[PDB]
Every structure is written in C-alpha cells, then in structure tokens.
Amino acid sequence: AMEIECRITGTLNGVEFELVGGGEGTPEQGRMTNKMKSTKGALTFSPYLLSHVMFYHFGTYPSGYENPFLHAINNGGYTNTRIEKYEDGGVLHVSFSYRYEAGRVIGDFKVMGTGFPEDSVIFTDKIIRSNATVEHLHPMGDNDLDGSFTRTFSLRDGGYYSSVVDSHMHFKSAIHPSILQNGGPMFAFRRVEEDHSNTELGIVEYQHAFKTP
Amino acid sequence: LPAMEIECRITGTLNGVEFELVGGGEGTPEQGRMTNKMKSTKGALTFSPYLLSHVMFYHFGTYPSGYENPFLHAINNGGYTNTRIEKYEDGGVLHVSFSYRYEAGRVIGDFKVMGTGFPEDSVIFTDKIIRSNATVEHLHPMGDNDLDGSFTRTFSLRDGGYYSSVVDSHMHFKSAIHPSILQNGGPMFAFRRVEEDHSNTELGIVEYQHAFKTP
Amino acid sequence: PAMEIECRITGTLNGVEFELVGGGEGTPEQGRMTNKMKSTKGALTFSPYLLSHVMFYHFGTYPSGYENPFLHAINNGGYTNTRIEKYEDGGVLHVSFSYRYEAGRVIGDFKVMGTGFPEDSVIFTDKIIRSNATVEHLHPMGDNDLDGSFTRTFSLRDGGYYSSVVDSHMHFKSAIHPSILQNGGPMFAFRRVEEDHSNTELGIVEYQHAFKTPD
Amino acid sequence: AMEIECRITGTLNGVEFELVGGGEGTPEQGRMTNKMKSTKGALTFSPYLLSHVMFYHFGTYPSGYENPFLHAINNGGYTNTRIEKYEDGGVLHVSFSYRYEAGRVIGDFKVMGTGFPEDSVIFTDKIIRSNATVEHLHPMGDNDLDGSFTRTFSLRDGGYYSSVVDSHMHFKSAIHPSILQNGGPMFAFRRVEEDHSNTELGIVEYQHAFKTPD
Description:
The first copy, chain A, has 2 helices and 12 strands.
C-alpha cells in the first residue's frame, strides 16, 4: 500500500469549511480509502458533495499503459484543477496539490463553491449517493491532460442531480510515453462507496482506466 | 440471431450549404456491429466527411448480462427519437435529429443536420482530420420515457493534434424504456468506436457499440 | 414607411407538432413591429411565451453612422439566422429563420425544434407571465457572418425568473454592410417584446434598438 | 472621488503572479482608474487578460435606480465570483472581495487561470484592446445577483479573441429595492482604456447601467 494524508479547505456560498484525514491505497488494485473529519462543525451542505474531492495515483491502467499520475511521483508530479457546473447553477472550483514521502502521498486541496441557490438539493438530505463516472482523458501536448465527465447523484426520489466536470492536469515532466503515444483518449471509470455524516466523511474509491471495455 | 438491413438518408446544411447522403449497410446487435456506406447526391462535401461518421443506429449495441438494449426494445413499440447538440471547440455547432422507420429485419434512419457557426479557418474545411476517436457516453433516464446522454468526442489530426467537441443528447421514447434500464441504480455507459473509410462523396463506417455498468 | 409582415412558424416541442400563421407590420425607423399569429392545430401544448422571440431583425433602429445590416441585406441576397437556445432546465430550442422579400413586405418561414424539456418544466405550466428584455452582443465572424449571444429571462407568476442562453449565427449572402464591418468592437441590440397571448392566439409588439454606447 | 486600493494574486497555468496599486473614481460620473505593478517581474501572459480584474461601485444607474454595489458599502457589502471561459479552452476563476474605509474601497482579488493552450493568443502580443461589454444582471431572491456577458478582445490582425463570463454576486444584506423590485434585468455597459506593459498596468473604466438604452 501507500499512505494518504489529506486536508481540504474552502468556502461554499461564502461559508468556510475544513476537513482533515487520510487513509491508504493500493494502486495495483486501483483502490483507496480516505476518512476525514470537519474541524469547524457540521458542514453546511451535503457531505456527498465532497466525496470526489476526497488521488488519481490509485487507478489501474490497461496492459501496456502506466498510470501517469503514479509515474509522476518520482519526476516532479502534477496538479489538477476542476471546474464543476451543477444543473441548478452552482459552481465548484477545485485545486489539488500533492507532496510525496517514501511510502506516502499528502494532498492539499482547495475548494471554492459559489452560486448554489437556496433551494438547491445540496441544502437538503435528498442526495443518497454519488454515482459512477467515466472520464474522457486526452493530452494537450506533452505536459498536460484534459479531462471531462458528467457526474450524477441519486436522490431519495429516484431522480438524479447532475453536473459537468472539466479538468486540467498539468505535469512537471513529460507525461508517461504510453499515454502520449496512445493517439486516442484514455477512459477513467471511477466509483465511490461513501459513509458520511455531517462532520465525519469516508470513502472507498475504485479507479480503473481502459481504452476499451 | 443475425443480420438486420440498414437504410440511411442524411440531409442538411453546414454554414448554409445544403448536403445530402444516401446509402446503408447492415448490422448485428448481438455483436454490437453495423456498417453504413453512403454517397453524396449534391456533389463533393464542402467539409471533412469525418464530421458525419457519428451521424451515419444505437439499436446495434451490446448490453451487459441482465439488461436489454432499450433502442432495440423500442423497435416493436412506438420507437424513439434522438436529438444531439454538439459544440465544437472552434465555435461550430451541429444540431442533429435522428428519426427511424421499421420493416421486418430492416431499420431506416432519416437524419437532419444543421451545422452553423464554423469559422472559415475551421479544421473541418481542411484535410487535417484523419479519424474519429472512441467515446463513452454517460446515459441516465430522465423519467420513464427519456434518456439524457453526454460525451466528449475528439478527432485525431494529421499533425498529432486533437480537434474536440462536447455532445449533449436527449432520447425520447414512445413507450416506456425497458425496465432493465429504468431500474438501474445509476448511469449506463455506452462505449462506441468507428473504422472510417471516407472520401467526400463516398463515405463508409464500421461501428462497434458496447454498453456496460463497469468496464 | 411600414413593411407588411407575414409569418409562418412550424416545429415540434418534445415530439409534438405545432404550426402558426399570421403577420403584422413594422416600421424600422421606429424600431417597432407587430405580429399576431394563430395556431392551426388547436391549443399549444406548451407556454405561448416560449414563441414570442420566434414571432424580424429588419425592424431595429441603428445609431447614426450605422445602417441596420438585416435591412440592408434585403436587396443583396439576404441573411439567415439560426439560434441555439439552452434553457436552465435542460430544454433546448433550435430555431432557424429564413426570409423572402417583395416590395414593402418581408415574409418569414421559421422552424423550431425544442427538445429535452423535462415534464416538470415551467413551459408546461402557466407560470410564465412575460419575457424580459435583452441586450445581444453582436460581432462579425468574417465579412459575411455575425455571431450573437445573450442571456434571456422570463418572469414567473410568483416572482421568479426562468432563464436561457441563446447563441446565434447570422449568415449573409453578400458582405455585411460596411459600417458594421468597419466597426471593430461589438454592436449591441436591445430588444423587448410585449405579449398578448392565449394558448391558440399569439400577439406581439416588439421594440429593437441597436447601439455602440447607451445614452 | 473615492480612492481605490487593490491587490491581485493568482496563478495562470501554474505560474504565480501578483499586482498592487490603486487609483480613484467618481460613481456619479461612472468612472474609475486603477494602476497596478507586478511584484514578481514580467507577466507570463498578456496583461490585457487582467484589465477586467483591475469595482462595480463606480457605475451610474438610471434615475429612480440606485447602484446596489455602492449601497452595499454600509450594510455589509457583497462578494463577486466569476467563471470566465475563453474560446481556446482557457478558464479564469476570479473571486472579488472588499473592505471599506472613509472615502476608500479596498479590493482583494484572486485569479486562478488554467488550461490555456501553449498556442493561445494570451501568450502572444496579438491582443490590442479589450472591447466594450453589456452585462445582464438579475436577482436570485433578495441577496443574490446573477451576471452574464460575452467579452471580446480585438487582435492586431483584425480578428477577435472571445470569452463568456458568468458572475455571482452575494449580498450580506438585501439588495437595493430599486433593483429587487425592477421585475426585469438591469444591463451594465462597461468600456475600458488600457495602457499596459508586462510589469505596469493601467486602465480607465466607465460603467453605466440602464433598463433601456435610448
């Protein structure tokens, strides 16, 4: 395994939040865990909104391809910035930065959430889980990948709440050549198992990349 | 079982210029396979024929154990329409509507394209595009009669670049969507890839479609 | 100084075919026009307000120094407009506008495809009470194309808003009037409609005022 | 006048930047000025990208309306957050916050810019000016305004570089009732004069809101 340390700080419609935590993961298994505690009270919004913010290092890649997030550990790393747009008009801006120790990844992530209306499902208990996603990944030259995915939550209703996520991963050194020399996209299937309250949050996440299913 | 006949007509305008293709092929849903070769009736196309590969039948897709192709299922009960809005990174938009007609072992697409807003310097008026890359669409039901889809779609360019688009789709069903799809916990994913053999009068694809919950 | 207006609108809204015919008159120099149109298929299955902005950019004032490019196009092969409108509940309206001219008369034939409006959409209720005003940002895409974009709202009976984003593509047969092209910087087009609508009978009065700076 | 102090911090495509300075302006006139210097050497991108980050307080409103941004100065103020999408795929996320003093508004502004490709116009000297814009503003209940505008730059060759800008303004106290009770949008016309080098940036800006243009 590898050890994970995680801190998440930001504001949602102006309200400050912070979570602190960690877990473990096993990249050859594409599995990781992260359990985290709010250090400033009950969160003011559904904690399910943060499962996807609580480490692409832990994803399996298909035979022939190296996880370029993993491969970046010993060569200056990478950052990821996501703009997320929710169907009710709210916007989540997320920055991900990482530090590595022999045997550990530490992430420091910043969130800025603005524009969720007062009647937003994020201010209810309506969200019962985050659903699986497949991200489309392709290079933009040798140091950058561009990501896009749709992402939904299941509501008590039946019924779904949706968003669109666009991401930009900037790499210090050249992306692993298996990724660059590929010439079509790579797809990243992700799902979470979430066990949340309003002040303690936990995920198990599975990440499996593929060219074809 | 086997091998359904496909007929296809594509008409439309791209930046004002009327175009029209006709042709068809065949396909095997159990394999997730279809073919379609089509010819221009109005002379050479003014833009890359790769732009029409994904307009040249979601009936021809495999679905995992336990689930049925809802597009397939609809054939025998009121059917479905699909309308795509595709926004190209240089500002071009294609609006595409698919309508279908059904005969014994035969499926007939009549599709309308309105492309607008593409800049004179667009890659689509060059020969830069050399194939369409694979995609995975996120599909989720909207109530009982509708599926919403979204996917990012890229073309590879001669120089090693990419030309990209975002497609948003809305599928409306005349009868209820097959219960295997409605009872699902979350989205279904639809992986599609094409093999293209194009000129700008004489276009052909082979398409593979494989839906899954998990890869 | 008033041209006669004739108008047909045909389309579908989530599958359902609708058709309106009618007309009015307008005076460019005032930036004013009227249009009254009646459904040919009994009551509409959606808010009539949805059609107000489909119910003639010719009838717009332009500042001194400038000529209305729509009005200028009349005698030089004309223009088309295609708008892609994306409503905040996911509905999409794609509208195409084409024009015929005779002396003192413009004849419009308009095509609408609205898709993806959820069954809980405000457009299936009576809550929309009026469209609100807009300012479109317009700039040349080259010598024969205009790109427009605006935000549009309706007011809802209870005090809310239902919003959309409209992106428009105006393609001209001949060069755009030089004053708009030699501009460099956008032009802005303020529009407001007043509506007097039933579910079968629609009527508008519209004011259009283009500007580079507001007073 | 009021005096204007301002700080801008952010990163563009990973590169940290900072500017400090200020200027002044006259809300009755809808005019303000702001001159800023980089405190980490030359910018790595066109300084034109920053003119619209370099104070909605300095905008006129039509008779029978009051500037709700200026009204907010005593009753707890507002923030503004904008997402800006450039046509080449770059994104600017900008947060605006303020503090007040007697005859002074003090802005502190955070920009994060990502995903501008290596071939983007922002890495050239093609931009020659920011063009005029008209923002559509309307309320989301009593303490929120929603903004949207399209924004272009003119390029040396005669082309344009564009972006679409979505803004969210949150008010601590209810918006001015002249705005809340409009029952339509208010439109905000804005235009800029710019004289920038890669280290020293300066604009003049005018802002005039209106219900109808005439």
